Amino acid sequence: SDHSIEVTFRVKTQQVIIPEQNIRGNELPLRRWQMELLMLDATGKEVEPTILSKCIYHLHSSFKQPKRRLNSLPFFIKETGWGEFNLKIECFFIGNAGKFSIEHDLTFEDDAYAVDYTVDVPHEFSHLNSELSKYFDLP
Amino acid sequence: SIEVTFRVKTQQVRRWQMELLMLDATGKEVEPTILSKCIYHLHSSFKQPKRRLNSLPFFIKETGWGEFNLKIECFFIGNAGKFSIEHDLTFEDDAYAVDYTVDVPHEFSHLNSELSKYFDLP
Amino acid sequence: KQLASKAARKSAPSTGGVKY
């Protein structure tokens, strides 16, 4: 939109098999995994996503309180499980300027990986703009 | 404008079935009673590709061999507007469901009368 | 809530405490 700009958000994921586990050969290892949502500034650099007021990790429903609300930075979550799954990361702009959803795949193929997502961020509203203008040139 | 989730349930054993449903306030699958018509825009190789279903349930039975992308055109009641769902037909699962979040107009009195049976309005 | 397929799946990559 000519009333929005493109902003890249980054999901940084980590996971490791928990050491010292008593598991048989046909049984799944438990892993400590973690995810954090960052923002890319105009240079390509990781910065705090200060244009978001709230972030929700919609975990797989086998977890309990699977709707994990994060009302403040940092938008970090860590957890223990055995399974890979796709999750909604529901992100809310500051200034009540709207929301978007990132569909992120939690996978255990690497020790750490990052995935980038492009979003249309509105640049018409004043309160969101004062924060956006710290990272991007707005029309 | 409020958010309503439309869900397409596809089955196959190919005798494949599709049925457009919607999620109510609790997340239970219910028939999309907020829709006038629901046309399934099949692939051209089928005869009479446009399948107009004037009444509920919006449920089709068909036999085929290929996997195609399918337009599910949905009209709101009281001529409140249109929207299209892009559903891909696949065969490596005997059954699956896919959700689609749609913006529904909140300024058509006839449409919100049926909308109000299920959700609260702004 | 009845789940759609994408949110419903949970999958396991490997068994055993061995990193592949």
Author numbering:
A (entry chain A): 1 to 139
B (entry chain B): 4 to 16, 31 to 139
C (entry chain C): 18 to 37
Provide the publication's sentences verbatim.
Lysine benzoylation (Kbz) is a recently discovered post-translational modification associated with active transcription. Here, we systematically characterize writer, eraser, and reader proteins of histone Kbz in S. cerevisiae using proteomic, biochemical, and structural approaches. The Spt-Ada-Gcn5 acetyltransferase (SAGA) complex and NAD+-dependent histone deacetylase Hst2 could function as the writer and eraser of histone Kbz, respectively. In addition, we demonstrate that a subset of YEATS domains and bromodomains serve as Kbz readers, and structural analyses reveal how YEATS and bromodomains recognize Kbz marks.
To elucidate the molecular basis of Kbz recognition by the YEATS domains from Taf14YEATS and Sas5YEATS, we determined the crystal structures of the Taf14YEATS-H35-13K9bz and Sas5YEATS-H318-37K27bz complexes. In the 2.4 Å Sas5-H3K27bz structure, all H3 residues from K18 to K36 have well-defined electron density, including an extra tyrosine residue (Y37) at the C-terminus designed for concentration determination by UV spectrometry. The H3K27bz peptide binds to Sas5 in a partially similar configuration as the H3K27bz peptide in the hYEATS2-H3K27bz complex. Two H3K27bz peptides overlap at the target lysine (K27) and the flanking residues (A25-A31), but diverge at both the N- and C-termini. In the Sas5YEATS-H3K27bz structure, in addition to K27bz-mediated interactions, H3 A29 and P30 make extensive hydrophobic contacts with a hydrophobic groove composed of Sas5 L28, R31, W82, and F108. The downstream AP signatures are only observed in H3K14 and H3K27 peptides, explaining the relatively higher binding affinities of Sas5YEATS with H3K14 and H3K27 peptides than other peptides. Although H3K9bz and H3K27bz peptides show opposite orientations and their lysine side chains adopt different kinked configurations, their benzoyl groups are inserted into a conserved binding pocket sharing nearly identical interacting networks. The lysine side chains and the benzoyl groups are embraced by two arms: one arm is composed of a pentapeptide (residues 59–63 in Taf14 and residues 60-64 in Sas5), and the other arm is composed of a GWG motif that is the most conserved motif in all YEATS domains. A π-π-π stacking interaction composed of Taf14W81/Sas5W82, the benzene ring of Kbz, and Taf14F62/Sas5F63 dominantly determines the specific recognition of benzoylated lysine by YEATS domains. The Sas5 K64P mutant, which may generate a more closed binding pocket with increased hydrophobicity, substantially strengthened the interaction between Sas5YEATS and H3K27bz but only slightly increased the binding with H3K27ac.
